[PDB]
Design a protein around this ligand. Structure first.
Ligand SMILES: *[C@@H]1O[C@H](CO[C@@H]2O[C@@H](C)[C@@H](O)[C@@H](O)[C@@H]2O)[C@@H](O[C@@H]2O[C@H](CO)[C@@H](O[C@@H]3O[C@H](CO)[C@@H](O)[C@H](O)[C@@H]3O)[C@H](O)[C@H]2NC(C)=O)[C@H](O)[C@H]1NC(C)=O
Ligand SMILES: *[C@@H]1O[C@H](CO)[C@@H](O[C@@H]2O[C@H](CO)[C@@H](O[C@@H]3O[C@H](CO)[C@@H](O)[C@H](O)[C@@H]3O)[C@H](O)[C@H]2NC(C)=O)[C@H](O)[C@H]1NC(C)=O
Ligand SMILES: *[C@@H]1O[C@H](CO)[C@@H](O[C@@H]2O[C@H](CO)[C@@H](O[C@@H]3O[C@H](CO)[C@@H](O)[C@H](O)[C@@H]3O)[C@H](O)[C@H]2NC(C)=O)[C@H](O)[C@H]1NC(C)=O
Ligand SMILES: *[C@@H]1O[C@H](CO[C@@H]2O[C@@H](C)[C@@H](O)[C@@H](O)[C@@H]2O)[C@@H](O[C@@H]2O[C@H](CO)[C@@H](O)[C@H](O)[C@H]2NC(C)=O)[C@H](O)[C@H]1NC(C)=O
Ligand SMILES: *[C@@H]1O[C@H](CO[C@@H]2O[C@@H](C)[C@@H](O)[C@@H](O)[C@@H]2O)[C@@H](O[C@@H]2O[C@H](CO)[C@@H](O)[C@H](O)[C@H]2NC(C)=O)[C@H](O)[C@H]1NC(C)=O
Ligand SMILES: *[C@@H]1O[C@H](CO[C@@H]2O[C@@H](C)[C@@H](O)[C@@H](O)[C@@H]2O)[C@@H](O[C@@H]2O[C@H](CO)[C@@H](O)[C@H](O)[C@H]2NC(C)=O)[C@H](O)[C@H]1NC(C)=O
Ligand SMILES: *[C@@H]1O[C@H](CO)[C@@H](O[C@@H]2O[C@H](CO)[C@@H](O)[C@H](O)[C@H]2NC(C)=O)[C@H](O)[C@H]1NC(C)=O
Ligand SMILES: CCCCC/C=C\C/C=C\CCCCCCCC(=O)O
Ligand SMILES: CCCCC/C=C\C/C=C\CCCCCCCC(=O)O
Ligand SMILES: *[C@@H]1O[C@H](CO)[C@@H](O)[C@H](O)[C@H]1NC(C)=O
Ligand SMILES: *[C@@H]1O[C@H](CO)[C@@H](O)[C@H](O)[C@H]1NC(C)=O
Ligand SMILES: *[C@@H]1O[C@H](CO)[C@@H](O)[C@H](O)[C@H]1NC(C)=O
Ligand SMILES: *[C@@H]1O[C@H](CO)[C@@H](O)[C@H](O)[C@H]1NC(C)=O
Lengths: 48, 289, 290, 48
């Protein structure tokens, strides 16, 4: 159960914004150009 | 790696009413600003290039260079006229007479602000006093809320009659003259507000749709939401007000086709563990996988 | 013209509980087989709801404050409740919006209404025909107008218990009046039936109006061309508060249950563990908050 | 609001919408005149 729960919480943590406008990479890359997208994606990369 | 491109936008044939909004014959006062809904059209704003020059163009929540590749939900255009000095107040987080008592933008505004000088038509040699703004009010307006009441104002907050010494009418008239300075010249402002990638949309950028390819890794663009994945038929039943579906990870895992209304599941292209067995690079360059 | 009902018993403002009603869909994203935590303006579970009735000498249509959005339930059997007026001053000094079923269309109009102090529709028991009535005396600064597709409302008093429970949630935010709605068949003689029913979005009106008060629109049943009467109907009003809810999406993607995280320590524990089922034991919860 | 119209209004270290809810310590007002082109220079980090 501990192993399964660790993996499942890892999966669920992908939904957490880390100070970024959204946790969905595709949404960010669809709305924002290279620079602002880079800022948001850097936040997401740090969090993940 | 994806090999093909799928683009699915809804059946839209008409151009958006750029001439009706940005080229209207009359504009409201800022205190009585008017809102107009926009739907079922192509937002090919390059047509504006030949007709309109914008002193101010600022977009929030979206990059200016992505507008051509998106579809917009709940599109509204708010139109009014202000002073040149007051144009800076049409933006989130501002203070001043306009942002306090006439027109307030939300902190989380998504959309764009366009302003352009209108001295030639909105100003006269004799002075045009048709445009107004509220100069006194008991408290500040809430975002996107309107107050067109005209009742006498008293700073003590009691019923009022104009003659009394502590009594003022709360609406002031802009005086727009031809010989005015740039800060006292009329500017027409259009605020476009919309949501982008969370609901059905009927206003779309000028893009060409392709055939729906299924069971193949593709680069897809559904109503402006881009990604890479494999599309399959879905058993999910979306409500009419739902356009996208998300899993526990917030990944967009389903979508309703804009044209056929079919529900399609989206899956990642990459999958499966791989390992490499080697006897040592010095011994050999042959590997097993 | 505007008619006044004389010798009306004052509203009693009887109090009841809301049980688990008032939940609506927080967004437009499809979800299924998932527990979703969301903070928003919800009606807290088992909150106080005020009842207003039309029966006998009671014609309860007072001005009720809006506060931060409301939940409005209607228990009826003869379609007595027809709509609402939302505004601030409830007169022609400020903008108001009327939402009403006039027995053939749904009409939403935002103008400067010279609202009648006693606005109502009129239905004749003799042959169940609605007669033209007055909801307002005048209107000149209309900013929003909407008329739906034609239909036919079933007029006429009916016997038995209340059969229809119609629920609405009204929320004014960022220049939009959000209206969520739901229907339920009931067989209740009186009171607000206990239960759960997720409300779906039906309107997002771009009104841009300052809304602080509202008054329900009802229909009177005059027995004679100069006297006023009433048929049985009831409605209930409750107030939304900012709070955190854990919603449950089932296989078809419908909200079938919810937990109000602030109701009691057990609800807080359920929201923290993200599950409707808690095992036996002792669990640390939030420190005592004031 | 009734007397002065400001071409430029920029606040640092504080949000314009909070000014009404604060008390200010050691308040000073520096006053001068410049060219229109030079107004942009009245800001931190400028050169000219
Ligand atoms: C806005 O509405 C007011 C009336 O007051 C409003 O409506 C009521 C039904 C209530 O809901 C009030 O709370 C609400 O404020 C209009 O003022 C009224 O105008 C009428 C028509 O001109 C006046 O009638 C006249 O009054 C005197 C005698 O009393 C004589 O001149 C005439 O014989 C005639 O009866 C009425 O007095 C006046 N006041 C009231 C209290 O009704 C107001 O005109 C309207 N504003 C508009 C239409 O712009
Ligand atoms: C809301 O409704 C009120 C009441 O009808 C409107 O006020 C009215 O506006 C008209 C049009 O501007 C005014 O007419 C003009 O007024 C002056 C009189 O000196 C002058 O410009 C013209 O000769 C003409 O008569 C009218 O006086 C005014 N009425 C009142 C009682 O104030 C108001 O405009 C409406 N608001 C909106 C936002 O539509
Ligand atoms: C929506 O409209 C209502 C009704 O017009 C507004 O309520 C009004 O709010 C003002 C400002 O807060 C109140 O005036 C002030 O009240 C006290 C004394 O009562 C004091 O701060 C000042 O001297 C001044 O008088 C006013 O009383 C109040 N009116 C009512 C009937 O409650 C409300 O502000 C509007 N909401 C928005 C968001 O614009
Ligand atoms: C959107 O339109 C398409 C295409 O149908 C029309 O004819 C095309 C040649 C072109 O002129 C389009 O713009 C027209 O709308 C409809 O697609 C239908 O469905 C199948 C796939 O299931 C498609 O391959 C066929 O071409 C179409 N068959 C028909 C129209 O009989 C689609 O249904 C339209 N969607 C909406 C919401 O109106
Ligand atoms: C909710 O309201 C009740 C009172 O409702 C009473 O019963 C109804 C059936 C109807 O007859 C109403 O008119 C009655 O008033 C509150 O219950 C009491 O509230 C008072 C005042 O705060 C309190 O001192 C008492 O202890 C409460 N208990 C009883 C048994 O009456 C209740 O507090 C209200 N809820 C909230 C959150 O304010
Ligand atoms: C909703 O889906 C169900 C099947 O899913 C189960 O029931 C749901 C209500 C919900 O509890 C899920 O988590 C469950 O897994 C459908 O139920 C059947 O629907 C058919 C018609 O399609 C009907 O004839 C059957 O009686 C239903 N009952 C069973 C036990 O299968 C239900 O129809 C779906 N709702 C719709 C289609 O509106
Ligand atoms: C309910 O209201 C609607 C909308 O006002 C009425 O239908 C309108 O009637 C007016 C006045 O005759 C017409 O000018 C409009 O064209 C109608 N609009 C429609 C049909 O969409 C309808 O008659 C009303 N029903 C009643 C009073 O019973
Ligand atoms: C009284 C002079 C000294 C300053 C007082 C103390 C602290 C700062 C207070 C207010 C700063 C805002 C000044 C007015 C500019 C905004 C008005 C407008 O946008 O038109
Ligand atoms: C000499 C031309 C090529 C540039 C030289 C190399 C690098 C960049 C050097 C300087 C940039 C600033 C130019 C002057 C503008 C600032 C002066 C002002 O604010 O008035
Ligand atoms: C608005 O449209 C008319 C008609 O096409 C055109 O002549 C005019 O130039 C447009 N607006 C302006 C400000 O010129
Ligand atoms: C742009 O406007 C000019 C001036 O009216 C006109 O001659 C020209 O044809 C227009 N071009 C397009 C592409 O509309
Ligand atoms: C119903 O009764 C009213 C009231 O007398 C009458 O006007 C009408 O003609 C009757 N019949 C109808 C509406 O079919
Ligand atoms: C604002 O200035 C105008 C123009 O001088 C004057 O008439 C009015 O009384 C002033 N209002 C206040 C509230 O000081």
């Amino acid at each position: 159960n501990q192993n399964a729960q660790a993996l499942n919480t890892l999966v669920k943590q992908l939904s957490s914004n880390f100070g970024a406008i959204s946790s969905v990479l595709n949404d960010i890359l669809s709305r924002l150009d290279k620079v602002e997208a880079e800022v948001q994606i850097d936040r997401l990369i740090t969090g993940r | 790696a994806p090999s093909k491109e799928v683009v699915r936008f809804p059946n839209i044939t008409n151009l958006c009413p750029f001439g009706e909004v940005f080229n209207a014959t009359t504009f409201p006062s800022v205190y009585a600003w008017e809102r107009k809904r926009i739907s079922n059209c192509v937002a090919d704003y390059s047509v504006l290039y030949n007709s309109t020059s914008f002193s101010t163009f600022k977009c929030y929540g979206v990059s200016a260079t992505k507008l051509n590749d998106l579809c917009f939900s709940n599109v509204y255009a708010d139109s009014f006229v202000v002073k040149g000095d007051d144009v800076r107040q049409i933006a989130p987080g501002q203070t001043g007479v306009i942002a306090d008592y006439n027109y307030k933008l939300p902190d989380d505004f998504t959309g764009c602000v366009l302003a352009w000088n209108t001295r030639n038509i909105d100003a006269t040699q004799t002075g045009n006093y048709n445009y107004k703004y509220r100069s006194l009010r008991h408290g500040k307006l809430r975002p996107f809320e309107r107050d067109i009441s005209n009742v006498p104002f008293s700073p003590d907050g009691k019923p009022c009659t104009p003659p009394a010494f502590n009594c003022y009418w709360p609406l002031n008239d802009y005086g727009f003259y031809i010989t005015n300075g740039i800060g006292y010249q009329p500017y027409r402002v259009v605020v476009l507000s919309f949501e982008l990638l969370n609901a059905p949309a009927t206003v779309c950028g000028p893009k060409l749709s392709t055939d729906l390819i299924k069971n193949q890794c593709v680069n897809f663009n559904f109503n402006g939401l881009t990604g890479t994945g494999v599309l399959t038929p879905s058993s999910k039943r979306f409500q009419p007000f739902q356009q996208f579906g998300r899993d526990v990870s917030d990944f967009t895992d389903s979508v309703r086709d804009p044209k056929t209304s079919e529900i399609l599941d989206i899956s990642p292209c990459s999958f499966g563990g791989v390992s490499v067995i080697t006897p040592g690079t010095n011994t050999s360059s042959e590997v097993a996988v | 013209k505007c008619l006044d009902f004389d010798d009306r018993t004052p509203p009693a403002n009887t109090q009841f509980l809301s049980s688990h009603r008032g939940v609506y869909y927080p967004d437009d994203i499809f979800r299924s087989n998932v527990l979703h935590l969301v903070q928003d303006h919800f009606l807290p579970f088992d909150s106080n709801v005020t009842r207003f009735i039309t029966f006998g000498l009671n014609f309860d249509n007072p001005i009720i404050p809006f506060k931060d959005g409301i939940y409005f339930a209607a228990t009826e059997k003869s379609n007595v409740i027809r709509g609402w007026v939302f505004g601030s001053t409830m007169n022609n000094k400020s903008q108001s919006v009327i939402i009403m079923n006039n027995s053939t269309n749904l009409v939403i109009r935002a103008c400067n209404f010279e609202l009648c102090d006693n606005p109502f529709f009129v239905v004749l028991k003799s042959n169940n025909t609605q007669i033209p009535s007055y909801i307002f005396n005048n209107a000149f600064n209309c900013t929003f107008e909407y008329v739906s597709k034609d239909f036919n409302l079933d007029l006429g008093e009916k016997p038995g218990n209340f059969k229809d429970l119609r629920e609405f949630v009204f929320r004014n935010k960022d220049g939009f009046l959000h209206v969520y709605s739901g229907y339920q068949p009931i067989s209740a003689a009186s009171g607000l039936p206990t239960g759960f029913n997720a409300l779906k979005p039906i309107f997002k009106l771009p009104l841009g109006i300052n809304i602080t008060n509202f008054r329900t629109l009802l229909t009177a049943f005059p027995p004679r061309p100069d006297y006023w009467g009433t048929s049985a109907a009831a409605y209930f009003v409750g107030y939304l508060k900012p709070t955190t809810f854990m919603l449950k999406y089932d296989e078809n993607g419908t909200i079938t249950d919810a937990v109000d995280c602030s109701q009691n320590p057990l609800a807080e524990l359920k929201c923290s563990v993200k599950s409707f089922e808690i095992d036996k034991g002792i669990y640390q919860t939030s420190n005592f908050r004031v």
